[PDB]
Design a protein around this ligand. Sequence first.
Ligand SMILES: [Cl-]
Ligand SMILES: [Cl-]
Ligand SMILES: [Cl-]
Ligand SMILES: [Cl-]
Lengths: 296, 292
Amino acid sequence: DISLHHRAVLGSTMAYRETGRSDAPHVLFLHGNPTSSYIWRNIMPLVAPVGHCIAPDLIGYGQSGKPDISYRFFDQADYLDALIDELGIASAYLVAQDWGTALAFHLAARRPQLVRGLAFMEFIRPMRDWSDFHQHDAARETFRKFRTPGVGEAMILDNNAFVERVLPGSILRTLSEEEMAAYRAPFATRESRMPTLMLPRELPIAGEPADVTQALTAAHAALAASTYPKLLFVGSPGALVSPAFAAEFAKTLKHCAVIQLGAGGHYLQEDHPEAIGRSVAGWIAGIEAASAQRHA
Amino acid sequence: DISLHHRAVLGSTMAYRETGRSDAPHVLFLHGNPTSSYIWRNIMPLVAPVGHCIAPDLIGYGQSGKPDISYRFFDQADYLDALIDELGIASAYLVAQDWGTALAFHLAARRPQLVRGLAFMEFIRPMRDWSDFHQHDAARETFRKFRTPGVGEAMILDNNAFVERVLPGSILRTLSEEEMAAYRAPFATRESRMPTLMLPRELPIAGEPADVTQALTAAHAALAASTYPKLLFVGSPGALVSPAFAAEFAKTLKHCAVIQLGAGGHYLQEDHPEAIGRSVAGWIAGIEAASA
Ligand SMILES: [Cl-]
Ligand SMILES: [Cl-]
Ligand SMILES: [Cl-]
Ligand SMILES: [Cl-]
């Protein structure tokens, strides 16, 4: 009862997973790099009783198409918007991680009416310099290498280091070979890996690239002035988001609850699917109940 | 992280567990029979980031006092009202189970602006006859015996059967020795066990006792008219509330969502702490955000 579907969008196709009844509010689950909707498989069933769950594979990821495009942040945003409009989604809760949070922020910034509430974790923000990126020097060095011409191509295009090393390296439990197999399956060819190389090159570090830095600064400003309900999950030590940074960040926002998942790195869904799922489903039930009173 | 505190109330004393920051909305956790605030120990920490969490030990339970009172439903209600006033709790989320739910409904009926939300499970309602009680003849027979003069006294006062038999019998997992010790600590003496016997005798079954039946009937009607959000947790098969009954019951109320927990009996917090606390915290966060 989680089904997979394809729709033609722009110059390609996109796939998504869907579950829950269709008369409930839309809930869009947005993955990051280098995962797919697969990452939300144990969480969607917990949200399905209160929401119509849709979990897209980003263009170039999962079961979505592999068009010949730049795979920049703005391309990812363009294809996700086009899937959303093709599905008729005018109002939704957003649930997101990594580049999925950049996409969510940027989406809420452009369409402030759409957002019924945002649940997010391990998010991206403009980073003034490298010390603002991640929690350990080994991760900075890896991403500096990804961002280096030739070197990055060799690590990710030739050796698939993002899927084969970064991903399992930032998850606490050991993934089954079935699980890894699902994570590597979209990236069997050298060229198919390109979107996984483009994204770390789009991370806004020390003002480069400038277009994404600008876009994510505007989206963080809009997030900060937003009034919709918000839920920030955080792991210890986390990766992009330490616990102390979470508390600090949360108080630049309105209506942002901070939920502690405990021990975790960057991909929190594989370590805490139950906690995330129950938290989000309860949150939606509360927002929907409180909004029905109020509007009565 | 969870601290234990004490307050003078009505010439005696009441204990309570506390966590969260005080700038947060009050969340009042209400245990039932024969447990204490101890039963919320794995849930409260999950709710702390969004709420100023307070879990009382009812009068006669946990580390609360043991005054010479009859320990009827109305006595528990008066002592609880008094603690609430002593702690300055004027607006709260209520989280509740068993006789804590009777207390929560009754409180909400008499103080309709107090309640910001009600999360509840395995709740008590006026039961027209014994077939509306629980889901097995053997549970009906046990409480019938509790309610019978002399027989109830021997089971509970002498043998401590509510604590030693009914409690662990309606929890799936096996309690550790440390956990059982904590549940029996307040009931070492024969006299101390009186409250755990008085509450089964207060259950409203076939109009008896009539005063509690009236009180809860009226609390149930206030619950049906009420507009605050509600979150009903259900176990499979449950004890007092089956999944089937939870579904019909929710549809009588406004803005009630039902969360299915899966395998459990009467005391859900010992089998589903993580699910309950994570849901309740998300819910409170959501309601706070949506109301403002
Ligand atoms: Cl992800
Ligand atoms: Cl990346
Ligand atoms: Cl209880
Ligand atoms: Cl009882």
